[PDB]
Amino acid sequence: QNGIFVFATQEPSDALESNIAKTLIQQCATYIFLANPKADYEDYTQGFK
C-alpha cells in the first residue's frame, strides 16, 4: 500500500557488519553512494553489489 523506506548512513563499514543491516542493504532498489577519502574493497563490492 505505497510504502517507502529511505535509509541513510555515514559509515557504511559500520553497518554491513551487523545482521540487521544485511537484509536492508539487499532490500533497497535505489542505491545512492557518496564519496569518502577512505574506502575499502570488501564492503563496497561484497555487500553493495
Binding of residue 3 to a copy of itself (CB under 8 A): no
Under the binding rule (CB under 8 A), the answer on residue 37 touching a copy of itself is: yes
Task: Report 10-29 residues binding a copy of itself (CB under 8 A).
Answer: 19, 22-23, 26
Smallest distance, a copy of itself to C-beta of residue 30, A: 20
What is the rounded CA–CA span in Å between residue 31 and residue 8? 10
Alpha helices by DSSP H, listed for 1-49, are 12-16, 19-26, 41-42
**How far is 37 from 48, CA to CA, in rounded Å?**
18
By CB under 8 A, name the binding residues for a copy of itself: 19, 22-23, 26, 37
